[PDB]
């Protein structure tokens, strides 16, 4: 026969891991909500935990 | 894992008005496992320090 491809073995090969990414972009940023005051922090903050204030 | 097997030929003569005709090499592959095990066991405790070692 011959040299023949048909013989030899032929191996396989691999590369290393690569991160997909899920796209849906997410912002609707910025609008409401933003701007923090500082009552809504008056509830942040421990102590005189919730629930909630008036 | 592969491997390349080893030739058997014979001769000719070679001479004057003859020529020579090739020949050819064969290949094949072998296979394995890999396994894995293990155990454990713990102690107590109490008993460890009213025993006298650990």
């Known amino acids: 026969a011959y040299t023949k491809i048909s013989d030899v073995i032929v191996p396989e090969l691999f590369n290393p891991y690569v991160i997909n990414t899920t796209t849906q972009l997410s912002a609707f940023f910025q609008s409401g909500i933003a701007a923090t005051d500082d009552e809504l922090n008056a509830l942040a903050k421990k102590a005189g935990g919730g629930s909630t204030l008036n | 894992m592969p491997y390349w097997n080893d030739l058997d ?46």
């Open chain 2, 9 to 54: 030929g014979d001769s000719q003569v070679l001479n004057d008005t003859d020529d020579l005709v090739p020949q050819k090499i064969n290949a094949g592959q072998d296979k394995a496992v890999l396994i894995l095990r293990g155990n454990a066991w713990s102690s107590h405790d109490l008993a460890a320090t009213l025993s006298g070692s650990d």
